[PDB]
């Protein structure tokens, strides 16, 4: 029940002081850092954009992320979206099909303008997103009808709207189509068992693409993937010494259940640490997730004073140690200390001075010593600030030199620098307890190894595992070398000095305290490299970089947080030990949360990536650009929780254009179902015509086709539709190419019209390249609005490019009262704008040809089966019966 918590002797059983937890400290941390800044900026002359350093709710943000595992991308339907529609002309032999997709796509984002680039970006995203959504199909349970020994699909599961047409059909055409309908069968049909139904139904290409990629995933990603990921946790379980269940995972898959895993477990360390200015946020996350709950223990009162007689008792040299904790004002100030060493060189310590509260200078002595044997300024990593250390050496020095008893021989050194002397009747340098950061000669692990790389780590950012004073937690489980001598070098030398110089009376206190001290440290180690190494842990790279970079004052992206303490607190921190109680509940689900974060993260990166290229793809569309724009629009359409994790440190108001560019260009990604879909849908997006915005926009003075009506019944022709959408572009040599700039200039000079007119008169063409334009498709029964026929691809109020560009389809309808020439006018009606897409949006069809659309594959899970997403079953305490590698 209590593995190492087993208290053998009363010596460890002290009183209870306070207690902390993950969510407790995580908040406190932020708070302290935020006060820091206000208190300085608000205090001194400050000049910068205003930021509201708020301490957000860590729990609720976390809980919101855990809520994401639920949100599924795939959507289960029983019938596919329409895809195709038929619009009837006066004709009875011909109709026109429309690819619904294109219409919907037509009206997705806002109109495109060279003015708002941000508008543009989101407009694209929305469009891409649209595709991805329109593609996440499943097709469970289909309307299988029986017909002549075969099971066929009901016209509802196909991809067409033809009901409109039916009434105008020739007995012949009707029949043909009927056969086509009961034509598409369920392939396997007569088999029972089955599991899946295969039919033929029609579908818009881009959408199909997604459906397929998805379908593949769900069939590729099964047991094994799941198996691995769980095994990973199963492995991390051992590193964190998890209490295990009596259950096991049978890789038994029911014939009903098709699994849908959305996130794999071994998470890519980098995606988390790639996020610019993450350091703080990450750290806090590390706390809030992995930092367990525990209580601070006091030593035994018997360690100092002991009763010999009702009248005779010993007195500890530090009677001052009866001071009741300097409010939370300083109690919290102790929490800083603990938390600081619990996070290697990630958090540094510094003095802090309220010119008020008058303390007895003795506090400095004690703290001078204490600081030296409880903080690690070891040349491996360091806990304290450069000046912080000096003050402790001066505290030490000042006090080695304060002799309340008979004075000893102090043989000073040539340097005025503190600790040059050699107090002791046997000399002994005090120069040793100086303060070299590259050596760590004064404070902790001065002659010790505290960074022990060893064993392959379940995480991989950090393979290191910290040994404060070279005490492995194991020494608790089973001792290493007696109880008499536990002494590590420094604490030992400290004693020797205290003796030689001042006095034993105090050195005795520390002598007896020693075990309590090391125990506290052993536990600390355990907690660090065992209980809390998560993704947010921090790579050894940056760790090792900290110390030297601190000395040179580089620009460590992971600038350590400098916390300010209180002289008093050291005493208090020294006399409290912290003993963990329960591991925070967040722990067992931690990895999952991590996966969610990381994967959602990468997805954004992907989006942003392609958007940066946009500027280079069509430099004319977005002149006024800036990366912040897209990354802002991306951040916009992505999940709050994630964004908040990034903004814990309030980084968003600091990340410079360059910083973000680097992150986009960084190439570490975390795969997820969402990821692959987004990327795939994203890929199809590269077409642009599939987005409904083209460069192919021309002008060419054209007559409105006024035909001769000699055989009205012969207008069963294609009802003579018109349309400005070009069958194919004009001969490239006959086209005058125009640029944003060219048009702009000519217009500003007031020559644009003239030139344009001339071109029109010469029966030549003119293309307006560079800009995209949203394209819309409208259909008409008769003579549409002039602002449409003679509509132009720009405003004239300076020449404003782009605009909407309407592709119309004018259907000619006529009654028997129409004279052959009745359609002619003394003067022609002109149409200028024309567009080209090389995508069969609206197409003239026969009638019997209507059903040709079918084409597409289609696999639909039989009604019998149950699709379940095994994504939230990634808890840590789950063991499998089939061990895996």
């Amino acid at each position: 029940q209590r593995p190492e918590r087993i208290k053998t002797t009363p010596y460890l059983e002290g009183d209870v002081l306070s207690s902390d937890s993950g969510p407790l400290l995580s908040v406190f941390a932020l708070q302290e850092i935020m006060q820091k800044v206000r208190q300085v900026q608000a205090d001194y002359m400050t000049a910068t954009r205003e930021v509201d350093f708020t301490v957000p709710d860590v729990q609720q943000i976390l809980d919101d992320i855990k809520a994401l595992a639920a949100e599924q991308v795939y959507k289960i339907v029983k019938v596919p979206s329409t895809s195709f529609r038929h619009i009837v002309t006066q004709s009875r032999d011909r109709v026109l099909r429309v690819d619904t997709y294109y219409e919907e796509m037509s009206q997705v984002g806002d109109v495109i303008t060279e003015d708002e680039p941000e508008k543009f970006y989101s407009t694209i995203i929305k469009k891409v997103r649209f595709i991805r959504g329109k593609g996440s199909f499943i097709l469970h349970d289909i309307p299988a009808r029986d017909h002549r020994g075969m099971e066929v699909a009901e016209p509802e599961v196909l991809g067409v709207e033809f009901k409109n047409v039916l009434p105008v059909l020739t007995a012949e055409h009707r029949a043909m189509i009927q056969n086509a309908l009961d034509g598409s069968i369920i392939e396997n049909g007569n088999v029972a068992t089955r599991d899946v139904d295969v039919f033929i139904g029609a579908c818009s290409e881009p959408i199909y693409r997604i459906y397929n990629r998805l379908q593949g995933y769900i069939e590729a990603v099964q047991l094994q993937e799941l198996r691995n990921s769980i095994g990973w946790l199963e492995r991390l379980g051992q590193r964190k010494r998890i209490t295990y269940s009596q259950e096991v995972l049978t890789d038994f898959r029911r014939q009903d259940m098709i699994w849908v895993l959305a996130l794999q477990l071994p998470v890519n360390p980098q995606v988390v640490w790639d996020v610019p200015r993450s350091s703080i946020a990450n750290l806090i996350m590390n706390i809030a997730t992995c930092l367990p709950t525990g209580e601070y223990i006091a030593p035994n009162p018997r360690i100092s004073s002991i009763t010999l007689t009702q009248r005779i008792t010993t007195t500890g040299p530090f009677a001052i140690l009866t001071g009741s904790t300097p409010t939370a004002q300083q109690l919290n100030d102790v929490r800083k200390i603990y938390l600081a060493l619990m996070f290697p060189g990630q958090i540094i310590l510094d003095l802090k001075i309220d010119p008020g509260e008058r303390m007895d200078p003795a506090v400095r002595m004690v703290a001078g010593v204490v600081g030296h044997l409880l903080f690690t300024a070891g040349g491996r990593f360091t806990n304290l600030t450069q000046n912080m250390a000096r003050q402790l050496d001066i505290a030490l020095n000042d006090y080695l030199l304060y002799m309340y008893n008979t004075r000893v021989q102090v043989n000073y050194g040539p340097t005025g620098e503190p600790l040059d002397f050699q107090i002791g009747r046997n000399q002994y340098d005090c120069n040793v307890f100086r303060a070299d950061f590259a050596t760590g000669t004064g404070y902790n692990g001065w002659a010790t190894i505290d960074v022990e790389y060893r064993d392959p780590a379940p995480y991989v950012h950090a393979q290191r595992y910290i040994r404060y004073c070279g005490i492995d937690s194991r020494e608790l489980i089973n001792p290493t070398t007696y109880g008499i001598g536990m002494t590590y070098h420094c604490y030992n030398e400290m004693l020797r000095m205290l003796v030689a110089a001042g006095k034993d009376s105090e050195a005795a206190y520390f002598r007896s305290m020693l075990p309590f001290h090391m125990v506290r440290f052993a536990r600390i180690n355990q907690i660090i490299n065992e209980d809390l190494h998560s993704v947010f842990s921090l790579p050894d790279d940056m760790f090792n970089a900290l110390l030297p970079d601190l000395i040179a004052g580089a620009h460590q992206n992971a600038d350590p947080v400098v916390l300010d303490v209180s002289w008093i607190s050291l005493w208090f921190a020294f006399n409290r030990s912290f003993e963990p109680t329960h591991r925070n509940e967040m722990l067992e689900i931690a990895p999952l949360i991590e996966s969610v974060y990381a994967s959602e993260l990468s997805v954004m990166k992907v989006d942003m990536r392609h958007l940066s290229l946009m500027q280079r793809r069509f430099p004319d569309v977005l002149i006024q650009a800036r990366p912040s724009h897209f990354w802002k629009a991306v951040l916009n359409d992505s999940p709050e929780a994630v964004k908040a994790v990034m903004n814990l440190s309030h980084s968003h108001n600091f990340i410079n254009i360059r910083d973000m560019m680097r992150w986009v260009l960084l190439p570490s990604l975390q795969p997820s179902l969402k990821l692959v879909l987004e990327e795939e849908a994203w890929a199809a997006a590269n077409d642009f015509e599939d987005l409904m915005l083209t460069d192919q926009v021309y002008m060419h003075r054209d007559m409105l086709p006024e035909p001769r009506l000699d055989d009205i019944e012969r207008f069963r022709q294609e009802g003579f539709y018109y349309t400005n959408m070009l069958e194919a572009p004009p001969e490239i040599d006959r086209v005058v190419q125009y640029t944003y700039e060219i048009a702009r200039l000519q217009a500003n000079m007031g020559q644009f019209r003239a030139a344009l007119r001339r071109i029109m008169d010469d029966d030549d063409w003119v293309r307006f390249g560079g800009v995209l334009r949203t394209v819309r498709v409208k259909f008409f029964d008769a003579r549409p609005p002039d602002d449409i026929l003679q509509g132009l691809p720009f405003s004239y109020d300076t020449i404003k490019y782009a605009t909407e560009t309407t592709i119309f389809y004018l259907i000619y309808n006529v009654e028997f009262s129409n004279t052959p020439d009745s359609l002619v006018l003394i003067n022609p009606t002109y149409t200028m704008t024309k567009v080209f897409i090389n995508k069969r949006i609206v197409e003239r069809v026969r009638v019997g040809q209507i059903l040709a659309v079918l084409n597409r594959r289609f696999v639909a899970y039989k009604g019998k089966m149950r699709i379940m997403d095994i994504t939230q079953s990634l808890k840590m305490g789950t063991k499998l019966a089939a061990p895996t590698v």
Binding site: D455, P456, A882, P883, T884, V885
Partner: protein
């Protein structure tokens, strides 16, 4: 890489501990096997017990050791049995730092790799002049035409010089030629009674001296001869003389059977019969190697792989002994009779 072998060794040596149930496992052992067996089963998908008993349970365990032993030796035996199949993945289990190994195994390997990778001085096995095409009768006089001193071979480690009265000369050249000796240990004697060209007895008078590099050396004493120094024989006596110089032994940097502690016994153990199953197995395994499939190599190997393979096979032999596995092999036909030296003899080709 050596680590891999150390693991595979530890595992086998551990399995050998599993004699016949009545055992309380050495706590340490349990831990190791468990980790290994676990990982192995996770890659083999086979059902290996930590404490086998049935037979099929035992076979499985043996097969494991086999798979590991082969993988550690880098051998691919191929289709040799219907009952067993080699899983190449066995290497990945052995490469995983998650499986420990004994200090015993670690040093055992370290020694093999250590010596095998370098050279050293070692007392050679046979007589110096063993690879000689011609030999002369011992004690019989022989003087090559125009020579005052004629040294010649009379045995594997024996030479005798024929000196005329008052004659002298260097002899070292008879020794040189055989690639590389580091220090030859000699001992010369006077042939007090030798045969003449005709057959009559002849005496060698006291006074004949032998000096190496100049310094004069006694008869019947061992001499640290560097093979390069001048081997000078003088005959101040007024009679014919014949002295025998004996190469008691010499040292060279060639690998002997003492390169690795009691290697001999191991090899013996490897080449030993046991039964047809073991025999045929061990045979089939070495067929992949440079080693003689069933007869002790004349010349002690000198490469890591060879020595290694032998050790592994030797241990795997003992495993076979404790486990008593029973399975088939292509071309092997088990004779159930009690088994005699006779039946064994016949098995070796």
């Amino acid at each position: 890489m050596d680590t891999i072998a150390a693991r595979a060794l530890t595992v086998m040596r551990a399995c050998a501990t599993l004699q016949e149930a009545r055992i309380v496992l050495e706590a340490n052992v349990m831990e190791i096997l468990g980790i290994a067996i676990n990982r192995y089963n996770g890659l083999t998908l086979r059902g290996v017990t930590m404490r086998p008993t049935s037979l099929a349970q035992r076979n499985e365990m043996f097969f494991m050791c086999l798979d590991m032993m082969l993988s550690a030796a880098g051998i691919n035996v191929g289709p040799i049995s219907p009952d067993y199949t080699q899983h190449m993945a066995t290497i990945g289990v052995l490469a995983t730092p998650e499986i420990p190994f004994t200090t015993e195994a670690a040093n055992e390997i370290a020694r093999v790799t250590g010596e095998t990778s370098t050279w050293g001085p070692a007392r050679q096995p046979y007589g110096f002049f063993l690879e000689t095409e011609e030999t002369f009768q011992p004690g019989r006089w022989f003087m090559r035409a125009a020579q005052a001193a004629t040294a010649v071979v009379c045995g594997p480690d024996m030479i005798q010089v024929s000196l005329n009265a008052g004659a002298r000369g260097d002899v070292q050249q008879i020794f040189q030629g055989r690639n590389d000796p580091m220090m030859i240990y000699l001992v010369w004697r006077r042939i007090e009674n030798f045969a003449m060209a005709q057959g009559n007895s002849q005496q060698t008078q006291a006074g004949v001296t032998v000096s190496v590099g100049g310094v004069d050396m006694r008869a019947g004493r061992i001499i640290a001869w560097d093979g390069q120094a001048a081997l000078h024989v003088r005959n101040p006596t007024q009679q014919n003389a014949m002295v025998q110089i004996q190469v008691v032994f010499y040292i060279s940097m060639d690998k002997t059977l003492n390169q690795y502690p009691a290697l001999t016994a191991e090899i013996f153990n490897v080449y030993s019969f046991r039964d047809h199953t073991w025999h045929g197995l061990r045979t089939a395994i070495r067929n992949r190697t440079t080693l003689p499939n069933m007869l002790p190599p004349i010349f002690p190997p000198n490469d890591r792989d060879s020595i290694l393979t032998l050790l592994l096979l030797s241990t795997l032999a003992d495993v076979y002994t404790v486990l008593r596995p029973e399975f088939a092999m292509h071309g092997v036909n088990p004779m159930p009779g009690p088994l005699t030296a006779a039946i064994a003899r016949a098995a070796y080709v």
